[PDB]
Amino acid sequence: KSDVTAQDVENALTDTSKNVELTVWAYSAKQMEPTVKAFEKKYPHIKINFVNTGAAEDHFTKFQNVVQAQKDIPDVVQMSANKFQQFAVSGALLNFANDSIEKAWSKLYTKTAWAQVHYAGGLYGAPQDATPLANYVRKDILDEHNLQVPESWEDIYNEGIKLHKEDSNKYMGILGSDISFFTNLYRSVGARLWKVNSVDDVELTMNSGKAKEFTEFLQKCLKDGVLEGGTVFTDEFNRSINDGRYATFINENWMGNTYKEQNPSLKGKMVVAAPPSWKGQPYQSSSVGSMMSVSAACPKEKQAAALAFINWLDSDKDAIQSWQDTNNGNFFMAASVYQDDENQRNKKETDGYYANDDVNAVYFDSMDKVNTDWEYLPFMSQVEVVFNDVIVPEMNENGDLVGAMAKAQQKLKAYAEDNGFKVTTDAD
Numbered sequence: 228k229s230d231v232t233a234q235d236v237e238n239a240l241t242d243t244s245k246n247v248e249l250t251v252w253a254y255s256a257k258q259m260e261p262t263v264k265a266f267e268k269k270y271p272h273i274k275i276n277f278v279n280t281g282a283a284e285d286h287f288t289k290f291q292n293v294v295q296a297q298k299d300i301p302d303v304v305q306m307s308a309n310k311f312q313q314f315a316v317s318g319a320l321l322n323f324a325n326d327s328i329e330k331a332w333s334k335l336y337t338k339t340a341w342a343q344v345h346y347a348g349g350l351y352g353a354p355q356d357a358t359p360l361a362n363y364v365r366k367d368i369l370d371e372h373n374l375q376v377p378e379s380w381e382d383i384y385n386e387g388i389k390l391h392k393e394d395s396n397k398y399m400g401i402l403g404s405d406i407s408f409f410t411n412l413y414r415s416v417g418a419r420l421w422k423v424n425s426v427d428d429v430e431l432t433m434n435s436g437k438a439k440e441f442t443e444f445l446q447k448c449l450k451d452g453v454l455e456g457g458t459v460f461t462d463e464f465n466r467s468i469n470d471g472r473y474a475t476f477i478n479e480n481w482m483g484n485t486y487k488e489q490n491p492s493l494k495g496k497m498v499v500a501a502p503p504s505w506k507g508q509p510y511q512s513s514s515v516g517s518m519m520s521v522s523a524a525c526p527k528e529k530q531a532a533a534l535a536f537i538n539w540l541d542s543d544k545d546a547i548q549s550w551q552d553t554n555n556g557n558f559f560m561a562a563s564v565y566q567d568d569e570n571q572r573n574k575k576e577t578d579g580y581y582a583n584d585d586v587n588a589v590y591f592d593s594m595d596k597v598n599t600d601w602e603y604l605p606f607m608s609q610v611e612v613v614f615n616d617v618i619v620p621e622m623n624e625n626g627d628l629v630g631a632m633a634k635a636q637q638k639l640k641a642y643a644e645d646n647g648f649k650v651t652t653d654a655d
């Protein structure tokens with residue numbers, strides 16, 4: 228049980244005679260590093276060795292490698308709310324839960340994000356960004372085809388048929404072969420793939436109920452040309468999203484900043500809209516986001532400073548402002564100083580990039596509608612492996628996503644059983 232209190236954390240910042248060196252690994256270096264530099268300017272006794280680990284997939288592999296070796300482990304490591312679980316459960320991350328941290332830091336982060344940095348009763352990071360889904364819509368393409376900005380999945384299907392019949396070089400959307408992209412869609416329609424009761428007790432529902440109905444719908448979209456299966460955040464995707472291959476793109480809202488940075492030619496052409504409803508339920512959403520975690524290997528005498536750094540970077544009012552100023556005037560932060568500020572909710576676009584200037588209001592409404600009735604499995608790294616091996620190959624116009632989900636569930640059941648988890652599935 229961690230005895231580093233909220234007061235001990237604050238003392239690491241005030242006790243400036245106690246010099247500390249922290250090694251920090253991050254994959255979102257572009258967005259985060261300027262605010263890291265601001266930390267170092269403000270607290271020169273805490274020196275940050277900031278390591279840009281490149282792409283997230285490489286970062287997580289590198290971190291697992293050093294943890295398994297028990298050598299050369301960073302003190303602080305970027306995590307995300309749907310990838311940290313297997314690191315937390317395996318003991319790679321410091322569980323810094325205690326009453327005083329819980330009491331103090333729970334007030335600093337919006338409740339949806341704060342819940343998600345817990346796992347199995349431990350506390351494993353400070354939330355960084357929230358990532359409510361938004362639908363980035365090429366309004367120019369829809370206008371050309373006399374199509375409305377879609378508000379539901381039913382609209383995506385019916386309008387997507389018309390679009391692709393009239394212009395077979397464009398699709399209404401992409402079904403991205405990425406575990407976050409894919410699970411975000413299920414979460415955003417209230418379709419549980421699984422339920423976690425405790426660290427060693429899980430239920431898989433990948434082939435029944437609302438999940439099965441949604442999978443059937445996605446396969447019909449693939450079969451009929453409404454969605455195209457493909458990768459996201461690859462060169463293939465980058466070409467497509469620049470060329471207008473997808474009239475809609477339903478994604479975590481950090482993409483809103485990515486378009487401003489990588490796609491200047493799309494200025495004025497997109498509207499940012501709410502993600503779609505399903506079956507005449509009110510629309511729901513999903514938020515994941517990054518978090519900053521401390522390694523279990525972090526030396527005891529550096530832990531207070533490591534926690535002080537993660538809390539400062541992710542919640543200090545100056546830090547939150549830096550996140551805005553260094554990311555085109557907006558970055559969607561989980562800290563309550565951002566989330567509870569009506570002027571962030573009503574913040575108007577000033578750069579002319581999106582065709583609607585109320586982008587943050589769309590993001591905030593989506594955040595309000597995040598589906599919190601959800602947990603990630605303890606072995607999310609294995610989930611991603613099985614997804615790549617079993618589900619991704621079926622994401623095509625002749626695929627069988629329904630059958631693939633059932634086979635993936637069987638593989639995850641065997642993995643769970645082999646690793647000491649109690650597991651039920653809807654196939655039992």
Ligand SMILES: C[C@@H]1O[C@@H](O[C@H]2[C@H](O[C@H]3[C@H](O)[C@@H](O)[C@@H](O)O[C@@H]3CO)O[C@H](CO)[C@H](O)[C@@H]2O)[C@@H](O)[C@H](O)[C@@H]1O
Pocket residue numbers: 254255258281282283284306307308309310356358407460479481485515516517
């Ligand atoms: C790993 C993801 O972390 C969160 O998303 C962050 C987003 O991550 C992207 C990486 O920067 C990129 O290298 C590659 O791995 O794609 C990732 C998206 O899946 O990066 C932005 C900045 O551009 C933010 O830092 C996001 O927090 C999380 O929300 C995702 O679901 C993933 O777990």
Ligand SMILES: [Zn+2]
Pocket residue numbers: 248249274275276
């Ligand atoms: Zn150093």
Ligand SMILES: [Zn+2]
Pocket residue numbers: 329345350
């Ligand atoms: Zn708690």
Ligand SMILES: [Zn+2]
Pocket residue numbers: 368371372393394397
């Ligand atoms: Zn067209």
Ligand SMILES: [Zn+2]
Pocket residue numbers: 461462463
């Ligand atoms: Zn390629």
Ligand SMILES: [Zn+2]
Pocket residue numbers: 543544545546
């Ligand atoms: Zn400050």
